[model samples]
Target: KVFGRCELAAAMKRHGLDNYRGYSLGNWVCAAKFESNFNTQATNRNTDGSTDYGILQINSRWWCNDGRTPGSRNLCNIPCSALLSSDITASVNCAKKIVSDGNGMNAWVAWRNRCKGTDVQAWIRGCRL
Candidate 1:
């Protein structure tokens, strides 16, 4: 599912992602914008030959399996395709696990490169959540 920024914000808020696991909602929103443009089906092949899946760009090497990928750790115990769902619950849950593992939003390069240290408050602008 492709979502507008405001619509994504509302959905994230409703999913208990506002300030979840100590990261601010602004952080999540900004990261998602860069990671996948709010498109659930987004996938990107990394320079390392691995792929990032879904809105958070969860990686195939450790988080989930695309099945054809060899040696995927699949630590999230989910199919990579699961991240492509309009229902974002699984992605959110897996993201929380990533955060709980101490990566925070740093697990996403987009967050580290674009969202971190930027003026991210605008990511949540106008949602009013």
Candidate 2:
């Protein structure tokens, strides 16, 4: 599913993404915008042959098992396919797990360069969250 900007903002808010770990709700929303354009089926293959899956672009090398990445740890303990579902609960849960691993939203490069320290709140304007 491809989500509208505010549509995703609302979903992230309801899933407890608002101020998660002191980051503004905009941070998460912004990352997802650049990472996958809010597409639940987004995928990116890295030079390492590992894949990034879903809206958060979760990495198969460390988070989800993709049956292709060599020595994948599956830290999220979930199949990469789970991150591609229209219902994003699995993707959201995996992203939170990634954050607790000390990466925070920086796990996504787009978030680091595009969303950090800027007017991220602009991403969620009019969402009323």
Candidate 3:
């Protein structure tokens, strides 16, 4: 599923990511905007033999079970394919679990490079959440 700017904002709030670990709604919005362009099925392969999946781009190395990553943790306890579903529940929950290690949204490099310290409020400025 492709989420509109504020649409994803609202979804993140509904999924309990808003203000999670001190990160605001727009922070997720901006990160998702760059990470997966709000598309639930997005995937990218890392140079280190791992893959990122879904809107949050949960990594196969740490979060999801891809059966390919060498040192898989599967901390989220789900298949990597689950992240591709349009229903964001698994992906969102996995993200919550991923950041629970005290990292916050910094777990996402996209957030670090593109969203960190930026005025992400503009990402959802015109839409009502």
Candidate 4:
């Protein structure tokens, strides 16, 4: 099985995360590939150009929920436990989030619908199954 509602929510909570902007795995991966080629070691500035960190490169100015010490970047590293519990899920979810949040599947639905197309945006607007 893939990321069910319970599992996804659990993973997000484990990472001390939320989706007020509403994201999905496929959308998340789309943004990841666009920004850092899915390299969980991704590190860069946030949208505001602050010192973003990790695979998602979550901006310290925004996702500074934890590990905000002087030079801490643990949450954004390769493991990405701060965002995902498993590598497989991390890759899938990140791609999906970017697509769905843009009005494709939505965070909860993208996992089941992501593979229906060639890319995250296509998958977002593609078939249901």
Give the alpha-carbon lDDT of every model: 0.87, 0.91, 0.88, 0.41
Model 3 alpha-carbon miss at residue 50, Å:
0.6
Candidate 1 C-alpha lDDT tens digits along 19-94: 8887778888898999999999999997777898899889898899887677879999999999999988888888
Kindly list the per-residue Cα lDDT of model 4 for residues 27-72, writing each as its tens digit. Answer: 5444444444445555554344455434444444333433433454
Ranked by lDDT, the better of candidates 3 and 4 is 3
Candidate 2 to truth, TM: 0.97
Candidate 3: where is the Cα deviation over 4 Å?
none
Model 2 has a clash total of: 0
Quick one: ranking by lDDT, best first?
Answer: 2, 3, 1, 4
Best-to-worst ranking by TM-score: 2, 3, 1, 4
Once fitted onto the true fold, the runs of candidate 4 whose alpha carbons sit more than 4 angstroms away are 1-24, 46-49, 65-129
Task: Give the range of the ten consecutive residues with the poorest summed lDDT in model 2.
Answer: 99-108
Instruction: Estimate the TM-score for candidate 3.
Output: 0.94
Q: Tell me the tens digit of each residue's lDDT in model 3 across 1-129.
A: 898888888878899988887788888889888999999999999899999999989999889899999888989999999999988899988888877888777889999999999998888788776
Best by TM-score: 2
What TM-score do all the candidates reach, one by one? 0.92, 0.97, 0.94, 0.35
